[PDB]
């Protein structure tokens, strides 16, 4: 059966009819630097979402 | 002397949605039924009814 070979979780309320979940990713880099440095590379993050019924 | 009446419907899913979202749907229908009865009484007083003499 599908209820024994696949994981079962309890997180969704009985009144919701649609749900949404998100995944996040990171971007950036690092470099070898010396003292008295001003230009330092920056990092950032982003996200994406999916829906279900 | 005459008798007056009406009714309304509601499902279990609507009851649960009203309990969860904080805005029930049954009380609005009850108010509508009461308003319909009062307006029918007023209309009978001020307009009459030919078939019912």
């Amino acid at each position: 059966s599908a209820l024994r070979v696949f994981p079962v979780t309890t997180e969704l309320s009985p009144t919701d009819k649609t749900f949404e979940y998100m995944t996040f990713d990171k971007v950036g880099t690092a470099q070898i630097i010396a003292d008295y440095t001003d230009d330092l590379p920056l990092v950032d993050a982003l996200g994406t979402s999916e829906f279900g019924k | 002397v005459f008798r007056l009446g009406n009714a309304y419907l509601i499902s279990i899913d609507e009851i649960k949605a009203g309990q969860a979202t904080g805005r029930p749907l049954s009380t609005r229908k009850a108010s509508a039924c009461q308003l319909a009865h009062d307006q029918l009484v007023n209309r009978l007083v001020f307009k009459g009814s030919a078939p019912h003499k």
């Binding site: - | 419907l9 499902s11 749907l25 308003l35 307006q39 209309r43």
Partner: protein, 156 residues
């Protein structure tokens, strides 16, 4: 100064609303296929599953037999285009017996007990090309710039 009091009346019905509590029948094991369905308009059956049991329905089309009329619901309907519609791929409440308020596009009040004629898009019209077993129940009213008609549906 003279005190004043005012008065105003509600409307009688809404499109797709069940008319009264007489003996009715709702077929809830239906699924919408290929398009959107307007509440208060007739539907057709394109396939009845032999084992699974669900019925596949869509909006009425030329040269087809209507099955029922979709009804209002505050939980199963999506709010799109400033009104209630039944979206594609979702369950639909289809009524196949009883009195219902239905969308119309005619101009004259109908007579009691006469046969109902439908248009190509699934709305009542006095000179439509689609023949139905249904009859007229006598209700005939108008919401804000919308015509409505009371129709009695018999089980197919």
């Amino acid at each position: 100064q003279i005190n004043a009091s005012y008065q105003r009346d509600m409307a009688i019905a809404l499109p797709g609303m069940v008319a009264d509590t007489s003996k009715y029948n709702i077929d809830g094991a239906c699924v919408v296929n290929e398009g959107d369905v307007l509440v208060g308009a007739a539907v057709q059956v394109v396939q009845a599953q032999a084992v699974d049991g669900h019925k596949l329905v869509k909006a009425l089309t030329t040269g087809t037999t209507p099955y029922g009329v979709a009804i209002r619901s505050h939980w199963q309907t999506v709010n799109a285009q400033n009104q209630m519609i039944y979206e594609d791929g979702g369950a639909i409440n289809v009524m196949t017996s009883g009195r219902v308020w239905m969308l119309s596009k005619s101009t004259e009040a109908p007579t009691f007990g006469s046969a109902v004629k439908l248009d190509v898009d699934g709305q009542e019209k006095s000179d439509g090309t689609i023949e139905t077993t249904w009859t007229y129940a006598g209700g005939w009213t108008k919401y804000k710039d919308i015509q409505l008609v009371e129709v009695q549906l018999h089980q197919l």
